[PDB]
Write a protein that binds this ligand. Structure first.
Ligand SMILES: Nc1nc2c(ncn2[C@@H]2O[C@H](COP(=O)(O)OP(=O)(O)OP(=O)(O)O)[C@@H](O)[C@H]2O)c(=O)[nH]1
Ligand SMILES: Nc1nc2c(ncn2[C@@H]2O[C@H](COP(=O)(O)OP(=O)(O)OP(=O)(O)O)[C@@H](O)[C@H]2O)c(=O)[nH]1
Ligand SMILES: Nc1nc2c(ncn2[C@@H]2O[C@H](COP(=O)(O)OP(=O)(O)O)[C@@H](O)[C@H]2O)c(=O)[nH]1
Ligand SMILES: Nc1nc2c(ncn2[C@@H]2O[C@H](COP(=O)(O)OP(=O)(O)O)[C@@H](O)[C@H]2O)c(=O)[nH]1
Lengths: 426, 429, 106, 426, 429
């Protein structure tokens, strides 16, 4: 099987560097080097993310889409930056304006064809394609607009292969932009109707989870990114490993989406202990479920405790008892019968790889489909209206060839999306 | 990628020489042009040894541009790029815009079309002018004017030094500034503002010195500006393009004018004291005594701030220091704006003049923003105008220079809707 | 003395609020009370900035003066707030104020 | 079986360091080290006080509750201080004011939830929980108030598991504080109605017993503490050892409490001889009962000779004849028929471990439930009234959100408690 | 955890320089700020290599604060933290509180809000003033005043040097001290008192020297004070927080004023004599000739004492030495108070000036307490007042300074109920 990553925008891009920083080491691939793999198993399934050309050069099969040179020229001028074949860099030296409209209708719409071109060169690579990974932020141009287009096109070209989306939904407390809800509401819209698996991460849900669950005092972006990339590795790549009970994107999809919206999840990693001290090793297993299922530790902003779950997928990856795994999951399902929805006898989807995260003994990625994420699109949707009402920075959109009915559309859509999700919380 | 710059008016040129100084100073390029892309968005690698500037200089009296071609830096620019009109400056808009200023413009443009070509996919022109002057108000007025048409497809961020609230110089100043605002308004992308007087306070209160030479205020803006282009167009952990600004900074087409502010302003001689915390500098940003503008947040609700940091800064430190702020409430942000905080993080710490009077910290915050505050500053400057116009005062000086009762009265009405604009976009929910 | 009150956060239906004491010697005004309430009710789910205003149990009117706070009262924290209104809180005993009930000889 | 110690306040804390200083050696557990145990028996039952994580790191399962950093930061910065998992430290950097009200209603009430949290993490450790050990002083904030709360909550969470309380009731002659009877009367109140086994120690009953029964001329606190900790080791831990006739907290409880008040005891150690000289070894056994049953040697302030006993528990721990033990106890019960209450044919509860205190040949902890302790709560209760009457330092309580009826309550309650206890002395 | 300090009035500043001296002296921090948490509750680690002061200095004449920025220690504080009002001091409350003193307060506060922020969960402000002065009585009056409102949620222990019983200085003194008492009364937590004259006795009778420079009395309080904050906020066998005090020390809301006392006051040159016993020093504490206050326990029943010990002390030694006392009866403690003995044990012994005149023992007892005794001291100081007010004496000096017949007469009535208060809480059962 296979997949082809997609680094839309700067963020989605910045993260690319971290997702590939990791993944590679979790596959023994040095900058341009080959497979130094401490083992021999980190190779029989690599294909999922690379391509064979030389014999020591397995190149990441991702796409780097962005209308701001400097960015990709920071990712390509640093560490692992020199492993991507230049063909991968689909830049847009234009003005990468922070407008969803500027990267979806006017500026991005041009650079698109020169992207799809490659997304096809990579898809028609070889063997059988599974789906595409998509990273980006719903709070900017090259991210929400142009990346949200990249998919609307992808999903017309292969409505068969899957589409996981890793979105950095606009953090609450403080937004890293001003129109944010504009660029956001507009991209979520496109999401709820193309990709079929979205993993929403919040820069501040991370800080928290990174400053209190990792006594880490100076959580640089690199970190946040690093933590995130840690989860997306547990998801995909991982399951493309052996296991007593293994799954793969689809299983994950076909066990997690009760209703076609596409629904968005909230990823959570397992061993998340501070370096030295904490290295408690309390990782027998009840310790991992202890972790994963708590409020804090959910990369999302919202707290599960604020709304039932529809599905859950503990994708563990480290030798354990299909008994102490299958078992724990249960008590968990009974101690919290309250929030776990009922019309699904077994919400949880236990998954079990074998080999764990390179240096760790036992981990377990969590992919939750809780109704709690209602209380986020609400947020976003609110911010919109409060500012849409006055058409705040709307001239930067319309003046870019947009529509007063376009914004209406998205909000509503994504706004209805909130509605539905409640239809199950009850 | 790049951003040309047109320093217009003696002042815009003095400030220019300054901002231009700080530059090489933090790029290891001696005044001889030679250093031993990155920063190419402000310097062209002409010949095979040098670093010819990436801007131009426009004054109608030679005096001031002359001094540049005397003092080291003399070697820095191209003999060509420093435009002059031996003729007369005239502290009057009209003459500088219409009558005289006209003659030079072509030639002026030519360079910003000759320098705009040589490059590689540019982003815009950082314009440097002094609102209340002759060559600075008038001229530019039509320079930016002729730009908005020749390159509507770019950024027009004009960095102005608008009229000291009580310590103005020219007798007419307002005539010249109500006129540079109305003519440039429909042409700029984002107009940065640095108040000459409100900067003195900083030199008195936050650095201590009753001996502030113009050469200092210049070192200051010369700093805040370095935080804009220089370092930003320079790689970092959270890059921010020029476009980025206007996008994340202007809510509405009016060439909106944010305010420049810097965090660490502390005098050398203090240079040894234990440095300030990420939290303190952040907080210093919300103090109306450190903002290079006599527009004390007397009520003006911020509506978007671009916190450009530089030096050793942990993104969480920021995505926390800002969080703390977002909840101080006494800092009331506009309604229609959930989050209006563009966090720009650079790497390389600031770079203080070897021995001026600037502390020299290992991190700073050049936060700029649009604040419903200027509702004031414009008001107080508009009123001025009327008083004189109300009696025609120095009107005969413009009329006789190819202007009319029109341009004045019709540029007054102009700003009028700038007093209503900056009022409506705020104060209301 | 002071005034015993049970402070709930608007839109929670889970957290049973936190009990605070309020007087002229502890808090010079509602802004000072609200300042400490931001620390004690500090959150990011039910309360945007932790605590900016205090509303009646039903959310019909917000208090602006300490003189409106009665003993054994029930209040809600808001910041918009938009009201659900979330009641909730129930149920708890009024024993936070005082135990109405006692033991009995069963 | 198991238990989870609780170091409430500074005192209760200071003592923690001594109770664990000891106990560990009585279980071969070095600072962070493991079981160096001279034997193999000091391990089959450790669980009662530790947890398995590493394999050399059996960490004490106690709680350190205190609103004064410096304290726990003295216990954590000294000897065995680095064995407690940091998670154990439930500090309250607030102003640990010396007010019962400040650590029970205003300041402590906040830090409570962050405690109960852990008291549950430790309870739900493993196997089966027996009860919790509680150390503190009834003459301060973090001690009487906040610790007296910790239990009122514990006893609502597991009204099944037991609750031994080690209280440092306010010594007579001189009070090491001023409001003492305030912080005290208020905590005893909470005790008589939650914990079901209390061992009251008196800093001056110790001095005495430590300056005349140990020619010790400079009895530092460390000592007193040390002596106390010696008794609480004989009690618990001990009985969790084999024995011809062994008991355990309950036996101790179910043989010592005739009436539900909870009743408080007065612990007494056996071999209490000065170092060099005295090392008389007159420890055949009549020598231990000689000891234990004398007036002086009762860690309590009051003297048994001043009031009958209801129950007694000689918890011996050193190879001896179930005959010379069971026998002695008798004569003792007949030479003093006077004071030993009659409606209990056999007041005494003989208990007999095997292994003795590490370096000793034969010892025997004494846990007396004598009616004599009436003459102590009297004391306390007196001090109250004499000062309550004038509301002495009452503003420090009320001003902290208290009640004029709260103080009334406690005194009465604890005051009645005096009454009852006499109902048997007669 | 910490406790800021505001030394107000020349005196409060002289005493300040002193108490501030003893500090570094026993913390190995040379006058250069550098030493080669623990004590962080009084010093901020500005980085960095330095320490700086965790306090401020307020005088309306420069003279006295000036001298600090001359003599080594010059390096210790921040050039900023030493507030001055070049204007006029005026040995009159009114002027210092109202009229002049007002102008500075804001600024003053700013530091105790700027220094109060920088820290980590503080506990309060140890205030240092000289009751009968202009800048010391008046000013503070409103400083403590503005504190009780801005931080009602903390400790306000003001360390005063109230009027020598017969050896006063200022002619008005009482006017200034009946006024600092009434205005601060409803704002302080615990007011420590050290009588200037009654300290001389100690210098004559318990150290022998008819040459006591102010610089000495300061070394003394500079000692007793070190026993309060310094060492106490410092780990030990029986720690005692600041809150602890007010709690274990004030029976009633009146900002009650205990008295400071020290045990080992013996002159160097005696320095070799066999040291005193734990029992002797303990006993020395109950002698009305060693208490830094002319309030000889002429009848005043103690109602709470905080025996702060430091050095090598066995808790039993104390919990015995005190027992012996509790039964001396001639030391009669209040009725409503069973036990009123807060035993505070520290480790590190005292630290005497290298070569002043203080013995230098290996253990001391800084016992402070509330004694029905001050019923006197206040009385005798109140009476004073009347005599003059009875004739208005220097009244025109205050009136003309924004005061009225009100503030005097109404602050007299104030203390009146302080003569009844300190009477009722005792003498009766
Ligand atoms: N910060 C700063 N402000 C300056 C400087 N030089 C002048 N100004 C201010 O800019 C205005 C002066 O403009 P002028 O120098 O009179 O005129 P000009 O704009 O150069 O053009 P002409 O009127 O034709 O000479 C006044 O408000 C000055 O306070 C300078 O070097 N730095
Ligand atoms: N112990 C001690 N007492 C002092 C010292 N300096 C002054 N005093 C006493 O404090 C009072 C003097 O206050 P002043 O110096 O007159 O005034 P001030 O309080 O500094 O403020 P202003 O009147 O405005 O100058 C007298 O009672 C002095 O005996 C000192 O260094 N140590
Ligand atoms: N986790 C994370 N968030 C990022 C990174 N970079 C930008 N962001 C977030 O992305 C949003 C801004 O959008 P941006 O990526 O600049 O948009 P674009 O570059 O124009 O497509 C803000 O909410 C940031 O917090 C990153 O490297 N990691
Ligand atoms: N045996 C003993 N008593 C102590 C110790 N520390 C304080 N005490 C006693 O505890 C009482 C004071 O309460 P304290 O522990 O300071 O209260 P808290 O710290 O505010 O909770 C006094 O009666 C002291 O004799 C100690 O280490 N051992």
């Amino acid at each position: 099987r296979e997949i082809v990553h997609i680094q839309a925008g700067q963020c989605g891009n910045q993260i690319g560097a971290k997702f590939w920083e990791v993944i590679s080491d979790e596959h023994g691939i040095d900058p341009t080097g080959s497979y130094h793999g401490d083992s021999d198993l980190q190779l029989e399934r690599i294909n999922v993310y690379y391509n064979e050309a030389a014999g020591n050069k397995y190149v990441p099969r991702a796409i780097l889409v962005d209308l701001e040179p400097g960015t990709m020229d920071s990712v390509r001028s640093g560490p692992f930056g020199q492993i991507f074949r230049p063909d991968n860099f689909v830049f847009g030296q234009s003005g990468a304006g922070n407008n969803w409209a500027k990267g979806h209708y006017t500026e991005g719409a041009e650079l698109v064809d020169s992207v799809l071109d490659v997304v096809r060169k990579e898809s028609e690579s070889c063997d059988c394609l599974q789906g595409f990974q998509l990273t980006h932020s719903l709070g900017g141009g090259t991210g929400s607009g142009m990346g949200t287009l990249l998919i609307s096109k992808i999903r017309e070209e292969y409505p068969d292969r899957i589409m996981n989306t890793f979105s950095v939904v606009p953090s609450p407390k403080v937004s890293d932009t001003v129109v944010e809800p504009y660029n956001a509401t507009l991209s979520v819209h496109q999401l709820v109707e193309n990709t079929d698996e979205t993993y929403c991460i919040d820069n501040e849900a991370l800080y928290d989870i990174c400053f209190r669950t990792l006594k880490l005092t100076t959580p640089t972006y690199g970190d946040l990114n690093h933590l995130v990339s840690a989860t997306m590795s547990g998801v995909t790549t991982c399951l493309r490993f052996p296991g007593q009970l293994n799954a793969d994107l689809r299983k994950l999809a076909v066990n997690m989406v009760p209703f076609p919206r596409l629904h968005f999840f909230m990823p959570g990693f397992a061993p998340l202990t501070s370096r030295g001290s904490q290295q408690y090793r309390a990782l027998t297993v009840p310790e991992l479920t202890q972790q994963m299922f708590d409020a804090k530790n959910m990369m999302a902003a919202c707290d599960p405790r604020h709304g039932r779950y529809l599905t859950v997928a503990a994708v563990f990856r480290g030798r354990m008892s299909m008994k102490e795994v299958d078992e724990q999951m249960l008590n968990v399902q009974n101690k919290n019968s309250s929030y776990f929805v009922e019309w699904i006898p077994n919400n949880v989807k236990t998954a079990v790889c074998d080999i764990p995260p390179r240096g760790l003994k036992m981990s377990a990625t969590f992919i939750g489909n809780s109704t709690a994420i209602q209380e986020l699109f609400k947020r976003i949707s609110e911010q919109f209206t409060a500012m849409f009402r006055r058409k705040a920075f709307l001239h930067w959109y319309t003046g870019e060839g947009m529509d007063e009915m376009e914004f209406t559309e998205a909000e509503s859509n994504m706004n209805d999306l909130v509605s539905e999700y409640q239809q199950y919380q009850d | 990628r790049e951003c040309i710059s047109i320093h217009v008016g003696q002042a815009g040129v003095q400030i220019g020489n300054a901002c231009w100084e700080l530059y090489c100073l933090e790029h290891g390029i001696q005044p001889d042009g030679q250093m031993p892309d990155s920063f190419n968005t402000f310097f062209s690698e002409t010949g095979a040894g040098k670093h010819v500037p990436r801007a131009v200089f426009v004054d109608l009296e030679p005096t001031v541009i002359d001094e540049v071609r005397t003092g080291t830096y003399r070697q820095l620019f191209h003999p060509e790029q420093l435009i002059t009109g031996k003729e007369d400056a005239a502290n009057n808009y009209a003459r500088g815009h219409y009558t005289i200023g006209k003659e030079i413009i072509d030639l002026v443009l030519d360079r910003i079309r000759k320098l705009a070509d040589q490059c590689t996919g540019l982003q815009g022109f950082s314009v440097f002018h002094s609102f209340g002057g002759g060559t600075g108000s008038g001229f530019t007025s039509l320079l930016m004017e002729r730009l908005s048409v020749d390159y509507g497809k770019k950024s027009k961020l004009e960095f102005s030094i608008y009229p000291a609230p009580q310590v103005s110089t020219a007798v007419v100043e307002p005539y010249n500034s109500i006129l540079t605002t109305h003519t440039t308004l429909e042409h700029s992308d984002c107009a940065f503002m640095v108040d000459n007087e409100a900067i003195y306070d900083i030199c008195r209160r936050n650095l201590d010195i009753e001996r502030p030479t113009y050469t200092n205020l210049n070192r200051l803006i010369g700093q805040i500006v370095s935080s804009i282009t220089a370092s930003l167009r320079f790689d970092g952990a959270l890059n921010v393009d020029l476009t980025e600004f206007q996008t994340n900074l202007v809510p509405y087409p009016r060439g909106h004018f944010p305010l420049a502010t810097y965090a660490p302003v502390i005098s050398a001689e203090k240079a040894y004291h234990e440095q300030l915390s990420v939290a303190e500098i952040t907080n210093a940003c919300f103090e109306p005594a450190n903002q290079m503008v006599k527009c004390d947040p007397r009520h003006g609700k911020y509506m978007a701030c671009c916190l450009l940091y530089r030096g050793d800064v942990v993104p969480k430190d920021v995505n926390a220091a800002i969080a703390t702020i977002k909840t101080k409430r006494t800092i009331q942000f506009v309604d229609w704006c959930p989050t209006g905080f563009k966090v720009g993080i650079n790497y390389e710490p600031p770079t203080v003049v070897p021995g001026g009077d600037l502390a020299k910290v290992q991190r700073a915050v050049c936060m700029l923003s649009n604040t419903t505050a200027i509702a004031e500053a414009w008001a107080r400057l508009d009123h001025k105008f009327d008083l004189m116009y109300a009696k025609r005062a120095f009107v005969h000086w413009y009329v006789g220079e190819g202007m009319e009762e029109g341009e004045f009265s019709e540029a007054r009405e102009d700003m009028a809707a700038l007093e209503k604009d900056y009022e409506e976009v705020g104060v209301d929910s | 003395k002071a005034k015993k009150v049970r402070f709930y956060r608007n839109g929670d239906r889970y957290f049973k609020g936190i009990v605070y004491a309020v007087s002229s010697d502890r808090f010079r005004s509602f802004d000072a009370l609200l300042a400490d309430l931001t620390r004690s009710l500090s959150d990011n789910i039910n309360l945007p900035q932790g605590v900016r205003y205090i509303y009646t149990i039903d959310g019909s009117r917000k208090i602006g003066s300490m003189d409106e706070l009665e003993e054994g009262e029930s209040y809600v924290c808001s910041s918009d707030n938009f009201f659900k209104k979330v009641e909730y809180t129930k149920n708890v005993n009024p024993n936070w104020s005082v135990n109405v009930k006692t033991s009995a000889n069963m």
